[PDB]
């Protein structure tokens, strides 16, 4: 705990400041320290955790794809060595997030909104690990992402309305997993379409603000269906 001496409330406050300054590495370190205080996260705090590590790993994934594309065209060791360096750093961030979820965010999350959120995160960061895997552990990494997504899907369909933004974002990312990772484009298209239609039929129950939350993620599902069909 490098953040062990700072107050939990101060870590959350500085995480929000780091977001405003677009200092996402600092933001992730603050939220990691907040999680390691041992207390469950509020809805707002879960968002801060997601924002921080998504931006950090997002820049790592973008850099990895640039280097891997240069490496593919070439095939000295410099390009391979540097792609390996970024890849190792990306895997360390993914392992850090997965460690936080396993110790002990998931086991203490009883509510559907918190448990589905954490299981979706678990699937996401195993998916990011699967994007760069090439050895003997790729299939087990892929199945770990699939298992986390599947448990989140089972809970969300039981406890959430079809328009719930977390349920929508979960289905969106699980469909991306099917298309990009699992080589199951028809499963990806079927999931994205049924998720869109069932949310469309539930929009009439929502307020103006909840309507905007749901239709925003429904547009992402529509964008993928347009790209895939």
């Amino acid at each position: 705990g490098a953040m062990g001496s700072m107050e939990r409330a101060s870590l959350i406050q500085k995480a929000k400041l780091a977001e405003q300054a677009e200092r996402y590495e600092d933001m992730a370190a603050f939220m990691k320290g907040a999680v390691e205080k041992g207390e469950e996260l509020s809805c707002e705090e879960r968002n801060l955790l997601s924002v921080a590590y998504k931006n950090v790993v997002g820049g790592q994934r973008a850099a990895w794809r640039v280097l891997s594309s240069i490496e593919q065209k070439s095939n000295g060791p410099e390009v391979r060595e540097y792609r390996e360096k970024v890849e190792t750093e990306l895997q360390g961030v993914c392992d850090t997030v997965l460690g936080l979820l396993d110790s002990h965010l998931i086991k203490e999350a009883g509510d559907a909104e918190s448990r589905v959120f954490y299981l979706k995160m678990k699937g996401d960061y195993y998916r990011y690990l699967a994007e760069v895997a090439t050895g003997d552990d790729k299939k087990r990494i892929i199945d770990s992402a699939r298992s986390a997504y599947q448990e989140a899907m089972d809970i969300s369909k039981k406890e959430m309305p079809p328009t719930n933004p977390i349920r929508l974002g979960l289905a969106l990312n699980f469909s991306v997993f099917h298309y990009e990772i699992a080589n199951s484009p028809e499963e990806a298209i079927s999931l994205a379409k049924t998720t869109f239609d069932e949310a469309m039929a539930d929009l009439h129950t929502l307020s103006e603000d909840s309507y905007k939350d749901s239709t925003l993620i429904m547009q992402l599902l529509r964008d993928n269906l347009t790209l895939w069909t």
Partner: peptide, 9 residues
């Protein structure tokens, strides 16, 4: 290539 979930703009 496809879109995973991302924050609103």
């Amino acid at each position: 290539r496809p879109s995973s979930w991302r924050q609103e703009k």
